[PDB]
Write a protein that binds this ligand. Structure first.
Ligand SMILES: Nc1ncnc2c1ncn2[C@@H]1O[C@H](COP(=O)(O)OP(=O)(O)NP(=O)(O)O)[C@@H](O)[C@H]1O
Ligand SMILES: [Mg+2]
Length: 365
């Protein structure tokens, strides 16, 4: 009853699990060797597949469920089809529980012990029904959910901001795969207060991917008309994979090559893609997405009735904050301050959850 409390970031796009070990948070690798796991679940009767293997069929398999977080707290159901043609209705709690179960299972094997306790994170804007859905998901997965904490709070814990000696105002800019959250926190006496939030729950790294897809589709259109490219699910799965890969490479390099031999066929033979995409062109194509992240910063400043100079620290959270242009935009909006991105931005929320778990378990060594 007083064992380890793991920390879980249950994201729209990806999930991550961490635990305290020897007085430091450790991020646990899944069985594919990855430190994050896609929040994606595929159903084949009783055989349920989670994570990377499910992401590889997200476009091609009608019984693969993505983006379930968006339904948490509602009584909407998702449907999957059994082998015998009957339909199975699933709650968001049930599908989320499969992601939580997968994390729990591989965590147990890595740690070498059974695990029955967790802290799970949620967006700051989640209401009681949304939080309760998340707790229920944990319960279905065999986890006593010791606390639900907010994602920006978790990130601040990871950076140790609660240990600050003076009162701190902290801006959290969190750009994930599906959603964009800006939060202004006040941390005083080791307690967190959310002063203001803003953002767009329909804006995230997927949109940047989708712009590259749009671009490739327009390239194809210069040489081919009437292809009906969307109806080719195989082609669409490949385009999504290629787009995300190209985007990621452009966070580190100034150019990337998109190569898609035999993408689809026309009456004159195969359609191929060989395109060099520079960072500058990628940034021009995605400028409207980037710019949409600016006003939410100013929104939180306005609502909290602060001046920009009152922001003591900025935290970059979410995988998309690896993009150079995003970093630059944030710098431009809080002049003088160097944002924090030293803790891997797609692990920082889970790390904070794990620190919260250690605190709840007690025992100072
Ligand atoms: N190096 C990189 N450069 C650019 N984008 C990246 C990089 N690494 C990861 N991403 C993107 O980060 C996004 C996933 O962010 P992540 O923070 O893991 O999502 P999440 O926690 O599920 N949050 P959310 O989707 O908003 O509910 C995807 O769009 C990835 O392609
Ligand atoms: Mg996130």
């Amino acid at each position: 009853d007083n064992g380890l409390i793991i920390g879980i970031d249950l994201g729209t796009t990806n999930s991550c699990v961490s635990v305290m070990e020897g007085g430091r948070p450790v991020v646990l690798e899944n069985p594919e060797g990855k430190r994050t796991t896609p929040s994606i679940v595929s159903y084949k009767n009783n055989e349920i597949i989670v994570g990377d293997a499910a992401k590889r069929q997200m476009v091609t398999n009608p019984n693969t469920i993505v983006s379930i977080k968006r339904l948490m707290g509602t009584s909407n159901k998702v449907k999957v089809q059994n082998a015998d043609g009957t339909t199975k209705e699933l709650s968001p709690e049930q599908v989320s529980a499969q992601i939580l179960s997968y994390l729990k299972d591989f965590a147990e094997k890595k740690i070498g012990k059974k695990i029955s306790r967790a802290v799970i994170t949620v967006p700051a804007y989640f209401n009681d029904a949304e939080r309760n859905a998340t707790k229920t998901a944990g319960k279905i997965a065999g986890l006593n959910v010791e606390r639900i904490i907010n994602e920006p709070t978790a990130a601040a814990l990871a950076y140790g901001i609660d240990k600050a000696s003076r009162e701190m105002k902290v801006l959290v800019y969190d750009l994930g795969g599906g959603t964009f959250d800006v939060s202004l926190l006040d941390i005083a006496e080791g307690t967190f207060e959310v002063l203001a939030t803003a953002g767009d729950n329909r804006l995230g790294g997927d949109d940047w991917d989708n712009k590259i897809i749009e671009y490739i589709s327009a390239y194809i259109a210069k040489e081919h008309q009437g292809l009906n490219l969307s109806k080719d699910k195989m082609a669409m799965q490949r385009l999504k994979e290629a787009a995300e890969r190209a985007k990621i490479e452009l966070s580190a390099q100034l150019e990337t090559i998109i190569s898609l031999p035999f993408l689809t066929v026309t009456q004159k033979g195969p359609v191929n893609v060989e395109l060099k995409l520079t960072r500058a062109k990628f940034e021009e194509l995605t400028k409207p997405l980037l710019e949409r992240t600016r006003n939410p910063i100013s929104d939180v400043i306005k609502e909290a009735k602060i001046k920009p100079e009152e922001i003591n620290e900025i935290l970059l959270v979410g995988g998309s904050t690896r993009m150079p242009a995003v970093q630059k935009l944030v710098e431009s909006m809080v002049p003088g301050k160097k944002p924090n991105r030293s803790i891997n931005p797609d692990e920082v929320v889970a790390i904070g959850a794990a620190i919260q778990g250690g605190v709840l378990r007690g025992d100072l060594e």
